[PDB]
Amino acid sequence: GRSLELGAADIQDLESFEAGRGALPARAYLQSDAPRLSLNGEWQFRLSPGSRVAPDDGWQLGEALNGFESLPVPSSWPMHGHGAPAYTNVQFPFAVEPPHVPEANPIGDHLVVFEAGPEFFPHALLRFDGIESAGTVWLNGVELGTTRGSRLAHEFDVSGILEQGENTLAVRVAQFSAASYVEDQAMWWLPGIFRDVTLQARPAAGIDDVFVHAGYDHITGEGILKVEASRGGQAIDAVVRVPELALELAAGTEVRVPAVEPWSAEVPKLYEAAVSAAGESVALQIGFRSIAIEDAQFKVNGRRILLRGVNRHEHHPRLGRVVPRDVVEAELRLMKQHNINAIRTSHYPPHPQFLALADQLGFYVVLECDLETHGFESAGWAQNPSDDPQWEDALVDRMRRTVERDKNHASVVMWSLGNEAGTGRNLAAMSRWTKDRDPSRPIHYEGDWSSEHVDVYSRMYASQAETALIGQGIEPALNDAALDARRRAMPFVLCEYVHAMGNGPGGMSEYQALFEKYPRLMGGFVWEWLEHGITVSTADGVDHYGYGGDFGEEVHDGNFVTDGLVDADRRPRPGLLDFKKVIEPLRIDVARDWTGFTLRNGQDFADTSAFSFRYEVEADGGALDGGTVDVAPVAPQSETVVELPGSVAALAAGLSDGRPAVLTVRAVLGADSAWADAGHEVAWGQSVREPGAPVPPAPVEPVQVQDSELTLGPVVFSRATGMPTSIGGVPVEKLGLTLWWAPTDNDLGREWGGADERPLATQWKDAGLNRLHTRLLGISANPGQDGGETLTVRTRVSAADKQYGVLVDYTWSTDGETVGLRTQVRRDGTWVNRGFEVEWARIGLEFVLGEETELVSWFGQGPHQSYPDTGQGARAGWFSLPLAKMDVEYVRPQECGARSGSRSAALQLGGRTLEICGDPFALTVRPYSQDVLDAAAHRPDLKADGRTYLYVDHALRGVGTAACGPGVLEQYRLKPRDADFILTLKVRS
Amino acid sequence: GRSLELGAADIQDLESFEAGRGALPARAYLQSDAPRLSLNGEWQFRLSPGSRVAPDDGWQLGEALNGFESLPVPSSWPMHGHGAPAYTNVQFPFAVEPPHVPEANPIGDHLVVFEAGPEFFPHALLRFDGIESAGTVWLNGVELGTTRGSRLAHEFDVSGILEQGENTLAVRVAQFSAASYVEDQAMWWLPGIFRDVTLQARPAAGIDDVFVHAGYDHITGEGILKVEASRGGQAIDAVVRVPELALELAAGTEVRVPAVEPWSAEVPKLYEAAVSAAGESVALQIGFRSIAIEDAQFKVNGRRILLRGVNRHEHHPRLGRVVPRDVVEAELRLMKQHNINAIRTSHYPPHPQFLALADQLGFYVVLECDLETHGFESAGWAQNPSDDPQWEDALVDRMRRTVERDKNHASVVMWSLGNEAGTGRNLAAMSRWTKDRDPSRPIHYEGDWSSEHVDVYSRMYASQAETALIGQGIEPALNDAALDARRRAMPFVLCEYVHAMGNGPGGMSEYQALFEKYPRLMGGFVWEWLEHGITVSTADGVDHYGYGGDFGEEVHDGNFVTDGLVDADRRPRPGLLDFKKVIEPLRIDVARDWTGFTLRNGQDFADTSAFSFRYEVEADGGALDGGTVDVAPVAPQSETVVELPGSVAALAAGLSDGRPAVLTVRAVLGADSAWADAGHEVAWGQSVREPGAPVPPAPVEPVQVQDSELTLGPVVFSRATGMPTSIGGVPVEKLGLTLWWAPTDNDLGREWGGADERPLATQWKDAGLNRLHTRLLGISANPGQDGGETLTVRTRVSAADKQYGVLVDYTWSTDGETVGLRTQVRRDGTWVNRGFEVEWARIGLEFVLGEETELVSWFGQGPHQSYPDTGQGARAGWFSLPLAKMDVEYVRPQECGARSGSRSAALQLGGRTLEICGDPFALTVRPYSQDVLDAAAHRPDLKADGRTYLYVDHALRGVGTAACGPGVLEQYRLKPRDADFILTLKVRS
């Protein structure tokens, strides 16, 4: 009675704890003059549901094709119809029982035929830069070996197997393997041969590996150069020549270059280099820079740096893991254009080509190993591979391949062991290995807060408050004295902070102020650069992004995959516009009297010589004056006071009091850079001469009384409801108090702290703020001027089954041309529900107008949105936008589009224009209601009903980052209070 | 500057705390020989959204009609297109700020013209038996008065206003008023003139009110009769004659009748009576019964009674509050047919005609005042009308009208102050008033547990455990000694228990055993009699019931309105079938050896003389023997041992051992009653000779091996999955372990107790029991008999992201004809999730068959469903049903249809029959999956996919009553364990 189950052999392999077999030693990615054929293109492809039904029908030989169809390689095959993508955050999509794999395991058989010329004989290899998750490779029917480490390179010798003429490469890829357990990143599950496949000749007397060592002596200005070269693992004779520095030297010997221009993210100086053997030459780019930890500060080339970073995942809306080069270059430019200078490769090594672009454009790169076991946390870390001895060789291998591939690039300033893999022996082994191999780069890892085997203390999403304690060196001690002394001598980095999901992130300014002032604080990497949205079309042809659950997942985490500063197509979100301003490398403080501005050079190495300093004075009627001022270069971390031309300040005093005028000073690129054109804005500051409060109009018009209607100048009232039915010509369907907004993504996250951990959204629903009703208490006229009179309308607003409420009194007035509106809000009972105090989203007014708005203009902060704890990038000025462009295209619709700090506004309804003025208020205009906004799950759910929903707010709440990390900060919370505010309305034409 | 708001006058009235104005004194509902014209029929109707827009256009005069359309009176107008019904449980549908009302307040103007003949002059009145919630009445343009108390009667004098010839009655009804705050029952909000409107002549020398006093002296057998009669509030001369007792006496004098036949729910003896004045005579039905509380026992006519009760709401699927008389009679018969003997009029007085039917058919009635302020609880009872002095006159009035209307009916044995209105002064005033007016009926009220102003200690939904402590008189003491001594001397009643929502109720037997054994325990009233479903049709024409939220409610409580023993059309639910058995008034215990049966008379007054005692012996081939046995009448609360004919026991021994046979003894009506025909079943008992366990077939067939398939006799296997693909002819698409069922309504209720209060449904979702996956571990043959061999298939079942699981081993065998299946379940890790132990719905198997089942037959318990803590009414026998009739039509689909205690089963798939045998297992067969069941919100969502989903269970969980009250009891819980069970399969034809 033997065993009868099928495919037991393949499964035994997939469940193996060993690293792949049969591969050549891990080595660096090198630009080589050796022959090379890329096998990329259209391959043939067969998909099987599982190992047990995967045919064993000699398909490796590539003849008598059965069931194979065309597929482009590289690819993430679920992006091409085969199966579907699937997204989970923490959770695994399969039963947690390592190393085992589920029966439903997509198996993808790949096959391609290619011609091998004589230049690839006698010796050659095949190189796979990435296969998710488990590869088995055959060449002409013979097994080469297997691959483990989905984002790591593998090379297989094909000497004596490759044959002159055509050849048949066959690759079986399984989605799930034992390696899946250690690749649980928060992202889509996407199997396939998703990176370059290459045939490379390996001539005799060639160069297999090279290790560049380019240090900088910031005292003397010397460069410290040693370039190791090896073959088959042994050091070899080779000459390395760098023409610009006039050097010819032998590999393996360290020399001292008298003077070098150091490399930095700010000034990425690179020297072209070649290291040559008789049979092969490899070309290099050398950046001289030394990394050191000193006095609890992370220093480069002798200077503490500030990391302005983002977390970079590799994703493409239509192609999955495959990110085309032109997209990589574009997004890296876009980062530079937004003052970013650092990248964490969350949480696996990137495409090999990435590293050279980083060297060239200038980023401080945290290079992270492909390791994460986060789904074990929910079980108390039981069975965690990070501390299971059987997993040691697999994890050491992952780190080795990571380090070896990218070790020659000046842009890599930290090696990271992985992400959210807990604590354990194997993580210590990975660190010990790295410290031995490359002592030149400090080691990062957040998972072990004791920081026992790292060189920098890292955390994710620590509050502004805890960050400030750490900055001062007074955080709580570890229980072990020896470890505590060590950790307090380490600088501190936030490897993930200010979670950028939906509307937000809020609180960026408070983190940034701490980064300045506290040297120990290295900076932070925003989570994250890009939304992982997957494009999906409908019959009519409109496009929207799909998120967790939109692809039939049984187990998923919704829209958490869409949590980035740009959308999947790299279109900015407002968060990115704000982030740019927060991390601006120059500070510009315009003097109130407009005689000049304080300039502080926030850069770490460069001066101000690359910048042109320009000023403009703008008024309602357009620009009044402008020019450019000369600024002696300001050294790093230094500052001076720059005078402006006297004509500017003379113009300030000449303004009739009450007239609005904005002075803007901008720091712009004087010349084209490799990442932007001349005229690109880097930093800016403003001084505003505000317009005085608008005069309340004289109440000289009387209220004429009719049976069902009241009229007071241009505004008609319903005598039953007491609210306006029209103002001027434009009809009004509803007017009421607002206290609620359609929850943001942050509003849906849990409010950790106290006995109340309900999401703010849930607190609102329970309290009933979404379902407010208003009761009329009375309508009354009162004596005004010269026979005229005011109209007062008293209401009380509350919710069903609730006793608490607010008294709302509207007192109206008009002189015939402009309407005067005063609003008074009074608390009635105690605003408590289910034992906890109710907070408000806002204190404002909803105008539901009976006609559509084609265009919205305002004086205030813009062009893009701004909420109390955001809008850093919204500047003062005059703005005008079509209605569609007022909105923000978040993948899940939610509260957005508010323009805080508005002094005046103009809506254009057909041939009529509604003006709104008064003390600072927030502006929002939409073609749909709040209820349909909150109900919508995707953009297509948003329907214009033919109305205008106008929102005027006397107060707003913050947005925070409660989806992950701190909620709204104290100073931006909005607890129930009493309030009063005045507005003025007008209809012209 | 005066006030300009509209409709302030009407609103001032609606917000009044006073009882209606202008009405005649509250008095009894009386059958009178005075002329009378019912105004019921088609009236004219105009609906306005609110008071402020309700026209004041002299519509009362009934001429120049504008906007009026036909409407039948009585009615609940939202049931007739105008507006829509709306259901909330606790919560009010409007802002809680008494006495105020919302702006959105439907106002219904009603108008009818009628002819008044000379017989209605000089004096007459108009009578309204119910207007929800605020009436204003005009006759010929003059205001008569207003009404408050939606379920209470009101009478208005029309002398000098009524005119000979035609007359125009006009009634404005507002849905919401100050009275709404005190009418917050859990039910639909349905305004309208929903009860009879009548014109009654009031001749001179007539009789306005009458108060019958008919006591019984259980020692002597005497009746104690005094019939009061009055006019204009003063006692008057009148003769009262009762022909059957040969009595002629003057009203106002108490006499002693030598012998009377007492009245009870069991024997509702009624004596026809008339009390006559010169101008008017009123006919009466007198039931002689005395009510008394003695030795902490609620006694009638000297004997402690047992209340077998239901809570009766008034509802009709298409007509709302209007319940047609033929429906009332039908449902009251249906109650009697299910052994019910008591009714609580939850929570308002019923239609006046109700009381006579109760007197006639025989129910102990708890008559409840129209009062409930339950929506104030969530605010700590702040602003509760029950303790607000301004509400005293309105609430005293409610009680007065309640008592006065129904005070002549022997069926009313308790007056109840209302329901869930908290505690306060006005409730004490209502009690003081009642105790003064009618000392003959003890007072009920649950809201005040101290029981300071009541005569019985009442509770709702107290656990079986607390009920048992109360039964023994050892419950915790009140802090006040004086009140505690009082309360411990009171008998105890559950005014609501065993909540009958969805599948259930469970735990009825445990309550009932306590009711026996503990005299102090009065019994209980099930919540509730009927589901409040509202019929709603679709284009294709199918009907389904609507529940909270299906009618566009902004605020609602879902399907809680559907929580009854019958559906809105009085079709029984399984709960009713079980309840009948639990409260059966006779106990029948058949002897194992079939020589006789123990008979215990559980009745309180009657003997067994009304019953015929019949026996039958049933076998697989039909009935074997039957007859009827003579039983000397058994006295109340007594018992005897009845012998059966010797042929029965001789037949028992003659059965070949292993053959199944069922002896059933039934107590049936020997003669027609007023509530059922002769042959109606009241009680029953059984003794079963079980069929021995089925022999496992000899494993003499070998397993033949092929590439993709395995065969072992009639069963074909997939060699990849290891599961059967067919058995005999019938295809099998899936076979797996089950641990989960589609949550019941109870499963959705919170598990009060411990730090885990997540509904069991939520505990399951978090633990992943709904999303199980199975992994194949191995397939193996093993030596059997005479060359044959078994097939063992090892699997492990778990869920994604979870580590805990069960090992499932299937060992198969066959001798060619019948298949032998053994299943072994082993716990792997610890079954804990989010810090709490996971429980299971079931341990069973899902067979997904590739063909439809036309008919399902089984030997076991039936015909209807049965779960571990239900199925009391499922009896042993042989049953056969079409597939559709296996299912249960709960309004929200949910787990149902299981037949526990099954020994054998037969599914008929086309021309083939699948037999299943083995140790006791539960049977369920459905044409749709569990996922579509759990997904469905209404019956139309259930779609047959063309398959058969068969469920065989070795263990089930209870269902409990966690939707409101106790969850599943300890003994019926199902914690994770190891398990083993055997089955035998066969396909014939």
Numbering used by the authors:
A (entry chain A), B (entry chain A): 22 to 1010
What's the paper's own text on this?
Psychrophilic β-d-galactosidase from Arthrobacter sp. Furthermore, it exhibits additional transglycosylation activity, it catalyzes synthesis of GOS and HOS, for example: lactulose and alkyl glycosides. The functional dimer of ArthβDG has two independent active sites. Each of them is located on the top of TIM-barrel Domain 3 and is constituted of residues from both subunits of the dimer.
The mutation of the residue involved in the stabilization of galactosyl moiety within active site, D207, diminished the enzyme’s activity. In the case of mutant ArthβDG_D207A, where a larger side chain was substituted with alanine residue, the change in active site size and shape was introduced. It is situated on the top of a part of Domain 1, which inserts itself in a space between the top of Domain 3 TIM-barrel and highly flexible C-terminal region of Domain 3, and constitutes bottom of the active site, which means that its mutation to alanine has a significant impact on active site volume.
